[PDB]
Amino acid sequence: VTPPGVVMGLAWTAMGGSTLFVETSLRRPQDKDAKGDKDGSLEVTGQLGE
Amino acid sequence: VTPPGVVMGLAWTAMGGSTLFVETSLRRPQDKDAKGDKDGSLEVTGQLGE
């Protein structure tokens, strides 16, 4: 069913190809300040090459 | 059609030359405060050499 925020993705791996999923999630409560103005920094993960 | 904020650009690459584009875009809502006085800091990207 792919609950919100997950998407399928094809990938041309070193052997064959595989239907790797990509996922995301909140990492803190949202309304820390109704006026809050701070960039919603992303934090990537999964053995990234630069 | 070159939608706003994109300009053509010649480049004397390592082999030949190619008409690579340069692109830009807003990264936050601008009117975070109608009175806001913060430097519109740029963020360059694309494997920059210093």
XYZ file of C-alpha atoms in Angstrom:
100
model
C 0.000 0.000 0.000
C 2.958 2.425 0.359
C 1.966 4.492 3.410
C 2.492 8.240 2.870
C 5.932 9.350 1.999
C 7.336 6.194 0.486
C 7.951 5.842 -3.218
C 9.131 3.040 -5.415
C 12.199 3.549 -7.477
C 13.999 1.523 -10.079
C 17.772 1.335 -9.860
C 20.396 -0.008 -12.254
C 22.519 -1.745 -9.661
C 25.739 -3.577 -10.368
C 23.830 -6.810 -11.011
C 20.389 -6.764 -12.433
C 17.985 -4.126 -11.292
C 15.962 -3.846 -8.150
C 12.882 -2.006 -6.996
C 14.449 -0.055 -4.158
C 12.093 2.030 -2.072
C 12.879 5.550 -0.912
C 11.574 6.749 2.452
C 11.261 9.902 4.491
C 10.044 11.015 7.854
C 9.651 13.830 10.253
C 12.323 14.163 12.827
C 10.841 16.717 15.244
C 7.477 18.129 16.256
C 6.274 20.596 13.738
C 4.714 23.548 15.476
C 7.620 24.289 17.761
C 6.568 27.923 17.240
C 3.526 29.036 15.267
C 5.743 31.913 14.086
C 8.805 29.698 13.633
C 11.101 30.568 10.707
C 13.947 28.065 10.428
C 14.933 26.172 7.330
C 13.622 22.649 7.349
C 17.012 21.130 6.893
C 17.089 17.787 5.218
C 19.390 15.068 6.471
C 20.135 12.446 3.861
C 21.153 8.909 4.810
C 22.026 5.599 3.251
C 25.751 5.437 2.536
C 25.625 8.371 0.162
C 28.408 9.207 -2.187
C 28.848 12.966 -2.294
C 11.803 28.979 -24.046
C 14.206 29.420 -21.090
C 11.763 29.968 -18.225
C 12.806 32.877 -15.975
C 16.137 32.759 -14.280
C 17.890 30.431 -16.675
C 20.536 31.637 -19.072
C 22.554 29.934 -21.744
C 26.213 29.496 -21.184
C 29.218 28.455 -23.248
C 31.937 26.450 -21.566
C 35.400 25.422 -22.754
C 35.249 21.985 -21.175
C 38.009 19.402 -21.102
C 36.872 18.075 -24.475
C 35.222 20.400 -26.872
C 32.667 22.836 -25.624
C 29.062 22.459 -24.636
C 26.269 24.910 -24.041
C 25.572 24.057 -20.422
C 22.873 26.141 -18.734
C 23.081 27.759 -15.298
C 19.999 27.680 -13.101
C 18.736 29.376 -9.988
C 15.711 29.485 -7.818
C 14.171 30.701 -4.654
C 14.697 28.394 -1.714
C 12.266 29.791 0.849
C 9.154 31.884 0.861
C 10.465 35.357 0.577
C 8.047 37.330 2.713
C 8.784 35.458 5.926
C 8.248 38.928 7.446
C 7.180 41.939 5.397
C 9.616 43.903 7.569
C 12.255 41.163 7.408
C 15.831 42.404 7.047
C 18.075 39.413 6.458
C 20.751 39.149 3.833
C 19.460 37.139 0.939
C 22.228 34.599 1.371
C 23.115 32.668 -1.731
C 23.923 28.964 -1.776
C 26.060 27.878 -4.694
C 26.049 24.259 -5.878
C 27.393 21.988 -8.568
C 30.746 20.566 -7.486
C 32.362 23.966 -7.174
C 36.042 24.528 -7.143
C 36.830 27.332 -4.733
